[PDB]
Amino acid sequence: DMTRDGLANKALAVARTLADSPEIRQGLQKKPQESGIQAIAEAVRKRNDLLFIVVTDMQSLRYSHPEAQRIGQPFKGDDILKALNGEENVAINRGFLAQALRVFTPIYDENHKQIGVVAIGLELSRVTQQIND
């Protein structure tokens, strides 16, 4: 399963990169519905062939989701919990979208105080597709 690890690492690289967005840092200061995070999360998701890119605050409220109606509501999945304590995590789970290989990384402000989490999922069925080849 070197293939799965590869996919999770790529997804983590995307998550880590987004964790450093100034606008997301700022937006995390705004209201979920008026962030600007949704727009960025969606373009990045498409280009890296991902199922979802969900940014949350420290209470797990979503700032982005492929289903816009979920912005402003709590993240679904206990796999985000380790990340709300400053640790990265990788798990297989599902919220409202398809079952997925999911990764999580913390978002920090300039003083390294945690302000949120970037959660990214890879559709499980797509992981099978990649393995086959």
CATH number, domain of 124, equals: 3.30.450.20
Taking CA 103 as the corner, what is the angle to CA 2 and CA 81, rounded to the nearest 5 degrees? 135
CB atoms within 10 A of CB 111: 6
Give SS3 for 95. Answer: coil
Binding residues for (R)-malate: 62-65, 76, 95-97, 102
Binding residues: 62-65, 76, 95-97, 102
Instruction: Specify whether the backbone of 117 is left (phi greater than 0), alpha (psi in -120 to 50) or beta.
Output: beta
What letter would DSSP give residue 11?
Answer: H
* Packed helices 37-47 and 2-19: angle between N→C axes, nearest 10 degrees: 150
Q: How was this structure determined?
A: X-ray
Alpha carbons 100 and 52: distance in angstroms, whole number: 9
- As for how many domains the chain has, the answer is 1
Helices (H) and strands (E) counted in the chain, each on its own, are: 4, 4
Reported structure resolution in angstroms: 1.5
Residue environment code for 12-47, b if the CB has 16+ CB neighbours within 10 A, otherwise e: bebbbebbebeebbebbeeebeebebbebbbebbee
Alpha carbons 121 and 110: distance in angstroms, whole number: 27
Partners of residue 91 on adjacent β-strands: 102
> Among 18, 10, 14, which Cα is nearest to 115's?
18
Query: Tokens 């919220």 sit at which residue?
Result: 95
Q: Which domain, by its residues, includes 88?
A: 1-133
> Among 111, 95, 114, 110, which Cα is nearest to 54's?
95
> Among 66, 83, 74, 84, which Cα is nearest to 121's?
66
> Among 56, 123, 69, which Cα is nearest to 94's?
123
Cβ contacts of 102 within 8 Å, gap of 6 or more: 11, 77, 79, 90, 91, 92, 93, 119, 120, 121, 122
Alpha carbons 75 and 73: distance in angstroms, whole number: 7
Residue environment code for 48-57, b if the CB has 16+ CB neighbours within 10 A, otherwise e: eebbbbbbbb
Taking CA 68 as the corner, what is the angle to CA 66 and CA 59, rounded to the nearest 5 degrees? 90
Strands 89-93 and 114-123: unpaired
